Short mmCIF file of C-alpha atoms in Angstrom, two decimals:
data_model
loop_
_atom_site.label_atom_id
_atom_site.label_comp_id
_atom_site.label_asym_id
_atom_site.label_seq_id
_atom_site.Cartn_x
_atom_site.Cartn_y
_atom_site.Cartn_z
CA UNK A 1 -0.37 -124.04 146.56
CA UNK A 2 -3.50 -121.92 146.18
CA UNK A 3 -2.41 -118.35 145.43
CA UNK A 4 0.72 -116.28 144.88
CA UNK A 5 2.99 -115.85 141.87
CA UNK A 6 2.10 -112.16 142.03
CA UNK A 7 5.12 -111.12 139.98
CA UNK A 8 6.00 -107.58 138.93
CA UNK A 9 6.04 -106.35 135.33
CA UNK A 10 7.99 -103.15 134.65
CA UNK A 11 5.34 -100.43 134.88
CA UNK A 12 5.37 -96.79 135.96
CA UNK A 13 3.11 -95.53 138.75
CA UNK A 14 2.31 -92.02 137.50
CA UNK A 15 -1.42 -92.67 137.04
CA UNK A 16 -4.61 -93.53 138.92
CA UNK A 17 -6.84 -96.59 138.58
CA UNK A 18 -10.26 -97.64 139.87
CA UNK A 19 -11.73 -101.07 140.60
CA UNK A 20 -15.06 -102.48 141.80
CA UNK A 21 -16.32 -105.28 144.04
CA UNK A 22 -19.58 -107.09 143.27
CA UNK A 23 -21.28 -107.69 146.61
CA UNK A 24 -24.83 -108.04 148.01
CA UNK A 25 -26.55 -104.92 149.33
CA UNK A 26 -26.76 -106.91 152.56
CA UNK A 27 -22.98 -106.81 152.98
CA UNK A 28 -22.65 -103.14 152.05
CA UNK A 29 -23.57 -102.38 155.66
CA UNK A 30 -20.84 -104.65 157.04
CA UNK A 31 -18.46 -102.36 155.14
CA UNK A 32 -19.92 -99.05 156.29
CA UNK A 33 -20.17 -99.92 159.97
CA UNK A 34 -22.79 -100.11 162.71
CA UNK A 35 -23.30 -96.34 162.65
CA UNK A 36 -20.82 -95.41 159.94
CA UNK A 37 -17.24 -95.84 161.14
CA UNK A 38 -16.07 -98.93 159.25
CA UNK A 39 -16.06 -97.26 155.83
CA UNK A 40 -14.28 -94.29 157.40
CA UNK A 41 -11.42 -96.38 158.79
CA UNK A 42 -11.14 -98.16 155.44
CA UNK A 43 -11.07 -94.98 153.36
CA UNK A 44 -8.22 -93.81 155.59
CA UNK A 45 -6.25 -96.99 156.24
CA UNK A 46 -6.42 -97.56 152.48
CA UNK A 47 -6.49 -93.86 151.63
CA UNK A 48 -8.89 -94.68 148.80
CA UNK A 49 -12.17 -93.18 147.61
CA UNK A 50 -14.84 -95.77 148.44
CA UNK A 51 -18.26 -95.19 146.88
CA UNK A 52 -21.34 -97.18 147.86
CA UNK A 53 -24.58 -97.10 145.82
CA UNK A 54 -27.90 -96.01 147.32
CA UNK A 55 -30.08 -98.59 149.12
CA UNK A 56 -32.59 -98.13 146.30
CA UNK A 57 -30.15 -98.29 143.39
CA UNK A 58 -29.86 -101.53 141.37
CA UNK A 59 -26.10 -101.20 141.80
CA UNK A 60 -24.66 -103.53 144.45
CA UNK A 61 -21.05 -103.16 143.33
CA UNK A 62 -18.77 -100.86 145.33
CA UNK A 63 -16.20 -98.60 143.67
CA UNK A 64 -12.62 -98.20 144.89
CA UNK A 65 -10.20 -95.65 143.46
CA UNK A 66 -6.64 -94.80 144.45
CA UNK A 67 -3.15 -96.30 144.43
CA UNK A 68 -2.66 -99.87 143.21
CA UNK A 69 -1.76 -100.68 146.81
CA UNK A 70 -4.57 -98.64 148.34
CA UNK A 71 -7.42 -100.07 146.28
CA UNK A 72 -5.99 -103.54 146.92
CA UNK A 73 -6.08 -103.09 150.70
CA UNK A 74 -9.71 -101.98 150.51
CA UNK A 75 -10.60 -104.67 147.97
CA UNK A 76 -8.98 -107.34 150.15
CA UNK A 77 -10.82 -106.13 153.25
CA UNK A 78 -14.20 -105.50 151.64
CA UNK A 79 -14.03 -108.99 150.13
CA UNK A 80 -12.76 -110.76 153.25
CA UNK A 81 -15.74 -109.40 155.18
CA UNK A 82 -18.36 -109.98 152.49
CA UNK A 83 -16.95 -113.49 152.08
CA UNK A 84 -17.19 -114.44 155.76
CA UNK A 85 -20.91 -113.64 155.60
CA UNK A 86 -21.31 -116.16 152.77
CA UNK A 87 -19.79 -118.81 155.04
CA UNK A 88 -22.11 -117.89 157.90
CA UNK A 89 -23.40 -120.52 160.33
CA UNK A 90 -26.14 -119.03 162.48
CA UNK A 91 -27.61 -115.82 163.94
CA UNK A 92 -24.57 -113.54 164.17
CA UNK A 93 -24.72 -112.67 167.87
CA UNK A 94 -23.04 -109.32 168.42
#
């Protein structure tokens, strides 16, 4: 037992929310893609509005807006990737 017990509290879905993910500017790239395809796929697959801060801005937290399910998908992916980096081992070859 580590996670779960999501539960569901009676709540309408006639609104829009927005969340953020605190990550290092070094991982922001791993979310955008080698040339700039990753972010694209995410924005679509999740159908959310991802917004990454400039490489000179003191803001290293990404913004995700959309459907409770959409933002979640992007938040779960953006985190999974950024997390793996933290558990790195050596010189990522390839």
